[PDB]
Design an enzyme around this catalytic site. Structure first.
Site, PDB file in Angstrom:
ATOM      1  N   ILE D  36       0.887  -1.324  -0.059  1.00 18.84           N
ATOM      2  CA  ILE D  36       0.058   0.077  -0.196  1.00 18.84           C
ATOM      3  C   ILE D  36       0.890   1.364   0.027  1.00 18.84           C
ATOM      4  O   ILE D  36       1.849   1.332   0.959  1.00 18.84           O
ATOM      5  CB  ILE D  36      -1.031  -0.052   1.112  1.00 18.84           C
ATOM      6  CG1 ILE D  36      -1.876  -1.068   1.077  1.00 18.84           C
ATOM      7  CG2 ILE D  36      -1.791   1.169   1.419  1.00 18.84           C
ATOM      8  CD1 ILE D  36      -2.849  -1.422   2.147  1.00 18.84           C
ATOM      9  N   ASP D  37       0.639   2.206  -0.856  1.00 14.65           N
ATOM     10  CA  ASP D  37       1.289   3.620  -0.862  1.00 14.65           C
ATOM     11  C   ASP D  37       1.129   4.190   0.547  1.00 14.65           C
ATOM     12  O   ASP D  37       0.124   4.227   1.103  1.00 14.65           O
ATOM     13  CB  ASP D  37       0.679   4.294  -2.035  1.00 14.65           C
ATOM     14  CG  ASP D  37       0.839   4.284  -3.505  1.00 14.65           C
ATOM     15  OD1 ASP D  37       1.818   3.021  -3.643  1.00 14.65           O
ATOM     16  OD2 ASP D  37       0.216   4.776  -4.332  1.00 14.65           O
ATOM     17  N   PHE D  38       2.428   4.762   0.893  1.00  9.72           N
ATOM     18  CA  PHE D  38       2.498   5.677   2.112  1.00  9.72           C
ATOM     19  C   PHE D  38       2.322   4.992   3.350  1.00  9.72           C
ATOM     20  O   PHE D  38       3.299   5.364   4.132  1.00  9.72           O
ATOM     21  CB  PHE D  38       1.350   6.836   1.918  1.00  9.72           C
ATOM     22  CG  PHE D  38       1.376   7.516   0.711  1.00  9.72           C
ATOM     23  CD1 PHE D  38       2.477   7.857   0.038  1.00  9.72           C
ATOM     24  CD2 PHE D  38       0.034   7.853   0.021  1.00  9.72           C
ATOM     25  CE1 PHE D  38       2.149   8.659  -1.235  1.00  9.72           C
ATOM     26  CE2 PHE D  38      -0.143   8.338  -1.048  1.00  9.72           C
ATOM     27  CZ  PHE D  38       1.131   8.666  -1.900  1.00  9.72           C
ATOM     28  N   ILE D  39       1.725   3.991   3.681  1.00  9.67           N
ATOM     29  CA  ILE D  39       1.421   3.487   4.958  1.00  9.67           C
ATOM     30  C   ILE D  39       2.083   2.169   5.154  1.00  9.67           C
ATOM     31  O   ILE D  39       2.121   1.824   6.347  1.00  9.67           O
ATOM     32  CB  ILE D  39      -0.398   3.447   5.297  1.00  9.67           C
ATOM     33  CG1 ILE D  39      -0.904   2.455   4.459  1.00  9.67           C
ATOM     34  CG2 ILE D  39      -0.810   4.834   5.282  1.00  9.67           C
ATOM     35  CD1 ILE D  39      -2.367   2.189   5.131  1.00  9.67           C
TER      36      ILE D  39
ATOM     37  N   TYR E 239      -5.801  -0.849  -9.974  1.00 11.22           N
ATOM     38  CA  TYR E 239      -5.857   0.474 -10.283  1.00 11.22           C
ATOM     39  C   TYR E 239      -4.580   0.928 -11.014  1.00 11.22           C
ATOM     40  O   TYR E 239      -4.907   1.831 -11.802  1.00 11.22           O
ATOM     41  CB  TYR E 239      -5.925   0.942  -8.680  1.00 11.22           C
ATOM     42  CG  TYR E 239      -4.757   1.757  -8.151  1.00 11.22           C
ATOM     43  CD1 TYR E 239      -4.650   3.180  -8.236  1.00 11.22           C
ATOM     44  CD2 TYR E 239      -3.562   1.069  -7.082  1.00 11.22           C
ATOM     45  CE1 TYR E 239      -3.162   3.857  -7.968  1.00 11.22           C
ATOM     46  CE2 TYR E 239      -2.455   1.684  -6.763  1.00 11.22           C
ATOM     47  CZ  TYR E 239      -2.244   2.884  -7.165  1.00 11.22           C
ATOM     48  OH  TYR E 239      -1.156   3.472  -6.546  1.00 11.22           O
TER      49      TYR E 239
END
EC number: 4.2.1.127
Lengths: 361, 363, 365, 364, 364
Positions: D36-39, E239
């Protein structure tokens, strides 16, 4: 008795059997075991242990001091624990010097230096701690600091028209003074000096307006600017002062101890238990700062009064619901501030006289 | 003893004669003095823990310290064995009054960085009276240089204004605050032999022109010199406080209006056992506005020797507030207003402002 | 008849000028405004906004609250000469607080500049300029005259320099409401000084009647944006009620032309003609959408236009649900229906007409 | 047979290296770590700790979390050559984040100094030095080599200068765990450079066997304090499990001598031999006291020592109560049992032995 | 066509908007949400205030995406209804103005990557900004931002030229095909406005992403590439793929037409007897809209881009009704949005005219 961890006979036998009880050992484990959150984890200025217990910042200086007086007796009881007590005392001094502990002095507006003039509650405790550390360990680590602070206290006593030093400006307390004077006896024992010669004048002074000798109880506080003496007597004040004085002039404390017990101690539950009133003109127990009973428990130990020790601890410990988990002691419902501190101290306390005559290693 | 009360009215009025405070007043001095760190008179440092625990709004702290100080002055008259204690409490009162936490609203509102230099007569009036009472009780010169400086500022500001007196915030004139300033001049004169109190006559003539309704014996809320406006409502708390202070300077003035004041605002109820005070006209409701009408009337009653009204008001104020004495210290479980323990303390001990002026020396 | 939950008759509110006294409920509102130390909105000239903190007023709206209080106080000065000196003192405080950074500071934080008057920002400075003038008409005081001349000249010079008629709020945002306040403030200056700054008004009235109004519906479009030339394609009731009310004092024929079509377009009468509520835009049956002030500004318009029937209908909708109560001779609302509630109801109840404020006779000696 | 609430057999975890593939539940853990992006914790080299904020990780523990992730990723690189480049990239990010002030800054706030490497602080810099080396074994990259040489030399010079064998954490605090990490980091440097810094190891092994161990119970004492000479008089399971695991890669005979006595002293088998839980000290019946990591470090030791039986018993105790779930091919635990939970279970499941990490062949 | 339950307008209606030269009443009610209420609407003013985004609980790292997707939508609105083109222009002017505030780009500095967000890397932020600069100028004919547009276009062209892989990184050593797709499209927009040939770089980039970064059997791109190690994260992303194919369709339509069918096979689940569809985010799971939870919403944009009315209808039947839309005072709100960027991507998908058509936008 029900809810108690060990017999009074057991606590008073610790010195003779040369070992702490299993419940005192479990208290040293609370103090030393868990990384980061135990109070004696490191010399660093971190007070996580005190945050978890909800200790107000003004009281932290008292908590570190009472732990240290306890650890001094532990060093006498079991020589196999003397090096541990030493390490704990090194940490106690280190943390005592952090700004979080003394900083109330600056925030209130009284000055930027806590050791320069007045502030005898903080620096009295620090000076006694410096001395006990050196008696336990034989380490010179803090000697230069100890000499500097001892000399400040000697020069301030010399210069004041009353006998002693104030806490905050124009606040004189007999408790805080008792700690300062004892700290001079400790220095003398280490260095062969005679700073303790001041003690006689101080004992004569507090016996003038600051005590009611009929009731064997000191008045709350004295204020040199106005000359005023607050007109209430205080149990916690008296229990603490007589305990410390017993190590310097045992006759003084032996004179007043019986009248003190008459004045404040209530025996109940057919003699099995006792609780202590904080002042006169009331039926209520442990009013004010709520430490009357807990300081009386330390006095009882100091004076070798097994009966009152047992009665008070039967009142104090069971309601606080102690439990031992992974060989470590906690209380689910502590009844006052400084709770685990004062019960620790009272259980191990070897007498202030004995701490003065501590054989070096 | 009516129900929920701690001591008889007869007992409170007898304190001076018996030369001792009642046991409940002593238990209030214990709240004030006993507990380390959190009692209001623990030390002269700038720490207001006592006021944080009581939830006191910062704008009101100056009023709380002042009313404690007026109370402590009377305690010094009642029992000479307590005079040194009252002195020490008053030294602490002055010390804390000067902290920025107490006066700092002046700077934050944008009115200036110095609270005494000009205007702000609510704060510096109280401070000037406190400086004087401390010196009457103790005989100490500790604050005398500050007292002279502030007294002279107040004299020069009165002299320079075309109306009689000084403003609080700019363009706000209140008779209460002025009353405190003028009384503080009488105290200075008594200590130093001066005649600053000569200003009082002009001030008494001024407030009797547009600032009072003499039919109802009630002062108007406030006056505003720029526009010349007088807010058209009358105020009980304003009037009770002003008449109480004026009684010490010109007793005839307060005796003239006291009956009309009682007619205008006081409701007796519960078959004469109790009284409660309306804050303004055109309503049946009690203790509106700042909610201090009743409590200031209790101080006025004491000032004017009115045992009956004192008893009625205290029967209204104290029992609902559920007082209790624990370890010889007084608390209230449900205080009914701001400044509660302060104004009840004051009213119970108050010896009259005239008597405080004639306080015999210590040596 | 007194309808239920109402404090006084419409007949009573419209009679205030003739009887030379405010109703007892208007007096109890002046008590909320003036009585209690520290927390009343007109306590002092200082920069403290306790009154607005207690009411939960968002900071962007404070400038509107002080202004609408001030327009109300101007009419109170006309109604009862015994209250004119009090209205004056309240207006002195209004101006003083309007100038605090807490009120105008959104301008700097949003990144539009460090000075709120220098250029643009016609919502803030339009209100300030009208307030400066009303204060001087009520009191006869020259306290703010130097400031008033400086800001009047800024507004005159900015109108002169712009290719459209008027001034923007935020950069590239043109609102007819804010402009209406600016132009009226020029008429007030002219009345005090004998000048002719109001000569600009004709060009402005011709401008807003071109692209910025739908003349069939008698309703102004939401906003205009000079960079793109765009007109947001929705019509707004609160925009139109406010603009027509202010314009009525400058060119009464303009507002009289459109008032009937405005009522047709937005006003819903209900409960057998006892009540009215106002839709905020077209293509919906919902009332008081958007900023939720359609009904409250229409109540001010009805007063301005002498429409007693609609005034009564709207107030029957607005006041009773808000559960008013008078305690110690002071008015509160337990459940205000919108922002600016006690402000706009105060204004509408006392409003003497913007024409009348312009002709306010001088003060007593 | 699959015990209830478990994701894969013990046989499956021990076969990973042979089958040259991680289990599907280990892959789902790498997805939590990377997806997951960022987290996700391995999103970028930046100083952002969102992954750790979401998990409520106390700041003093973040250094341990990054380290244990890194030891796991090293074994993943051995198991499946197709994942070695991924492990490398994750290890580059691990080092990058280890160096942020959020991670080491407790050193300054505590009042011990402004530089976390210069002297003492062996818990932080031991981990960093081992991480520098494992990154270079996995990738063959010289990105961190100059930093690695500097820190290795500091550790060598500090060992040389001390009268006891090793380095302190905070001043006057000696822990055998932290030392074990430092010494292993010297073996990794030697393997990369042909040097002989690991010659210090023998003196250290002789030292810890004197006062710092009870050889009857096969358990190290909590801590040593050189100023007073004091040894805290309690024994510690988490301390011993971690130390024996690391030492096994340097001197296997040492750990094989004490492992049986360690199991006798602390490990409780229950539920008719299906499960085990570990006591943290002596004189109690209670499990996982103190920092609550006795069981989880014993699970890593069992793996290190090839003890399939105890591995299975402990994991039957630890995993099912923590209620794991796989959603969109990513692993979470609804009720983790302790600090460092997903970290230590990840490590234990993939761990190839510290010896094997030392002999890691080049990238090809 | 019958109106499915919980829907505001038919698919037939959305695809007819350009021909009928008017937006549907529900699109108009979304422009009202965007423009109507003073202070709190997202397109109130050019100022650096983000009240609209605070009220919606938008994380700061996502604000840049929200402004961009609004802007791509507003570009199509300008093509649909010439009476709305000046409004779209004004909304786009505000979009650019707010995109440049530090609240939007400041994560770059806080993370420790640099003090300038444009100078190098950070292709997610500056790609979006460069495309926005271009669409604003196509809609309005205004030269307001031309000097800035030339500066940023040249930076992107010079960074592509200097890199050994085809494209630019986001945060250092992170390569994403999505962000790159936005950058390359922004070059086509510049070329159309100025007659230049910066888009000549596109062929090398299309050949690059087809080598290791795609699985051509499944028609799906891998998550990310990391140039230091050469690693490709071994999961495929829906996505990522939906967004990339949609943007690429405007540049090389044959590329996206080749993979679109295999993409639908790989990720899209039809259910409820063909009335509805939902999209899996990766392989080896049955779960829909995992990860960032935007698989379905980006597929809805792709369906529109590729003229696939059937899949558009299916996805919108899945996405809109559970989110419980309501129109109040002629303005659109959702009581229960299903993901981040919800009202943004549904707005975009409903109006989207095709990226090719945006490129050929006739002058005002």
């Amino acid at each position: 008795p029900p809810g108690r961890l060990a017999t009074t006979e057991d606590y008073f036998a610790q010195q003779a059997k040369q070992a702490v009880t299993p419940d005192v050992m479990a208290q040293l484990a609370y103090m030393n075991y868990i990384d980061f959150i135990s109070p004696f984890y490191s010399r660093g200025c971190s007070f996580e242990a005190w945050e978890l217990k909800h200790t107000p910042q003004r009281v932290i200086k008292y908590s570190i001091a009472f732990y240290a007086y306890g650890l001094a007796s532990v060093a006498l009881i079991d020589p196999k624990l003397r090096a541990l007590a030493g390490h704990d005392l090194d940490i106690a001094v280190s943390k005592m010097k952090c700004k979080r502990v003394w900083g109330d002095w600056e925030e209130d507006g009284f000055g930027t230096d806590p050791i320069e003039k007045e502030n005898i509650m903080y620096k009295g405790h620090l000076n006694l701690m410096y001395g006990l550390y050196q008696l336990v360990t034989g380490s010179r680590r803090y000697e230069a600091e100890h000499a500097h602070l001892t000399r400040i206290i000697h020069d301030e006593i010399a210069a004041n028209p009353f006998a002693g030093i104030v806490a905050e400006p124009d606040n004189y307390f007999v408790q805080c003074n008792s700690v300062a004077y004892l700290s001079l006896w400790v220095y003398d024992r280490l260095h062969g000096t005679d700073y303790r010669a001041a003690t006689r004048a101080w004992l004569d002074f507090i016996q003038k307006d600051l005590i009611d000798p009929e009731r064997g109880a000191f008045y709350l506080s004295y204020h040199p600017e106005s000359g005023a003496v607050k007109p209430w007597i205080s149990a916690y004040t008296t229990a603490w002062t007589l305990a410390m004085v017993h190590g310097m002039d045992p006759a003084f404390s032996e004179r007043y101890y019986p009248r003190f017990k008459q004045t404040f101690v209530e025996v109940y539950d057919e003699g099995r238990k006792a609780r202590v009133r904080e002042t006169a003109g009331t039926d209520d127990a442990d009013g004010g700062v709520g430490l009357a009973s807990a300081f009386t428990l330390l006095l009882a130990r100091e004076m070798g009064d097994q009966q009152l020790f047992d009665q008070l601890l039967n009142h104090l410990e069971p309601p606080a619901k102690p439990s031992i988990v992974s060989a470590s002691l906690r209380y689910e419902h502590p009844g006052s501030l400084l709770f685990d501190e004062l019960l620790f101290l009272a259980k191990v306390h070897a007498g202030f006289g004995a701490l003065l005559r501590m054989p070096p290693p």
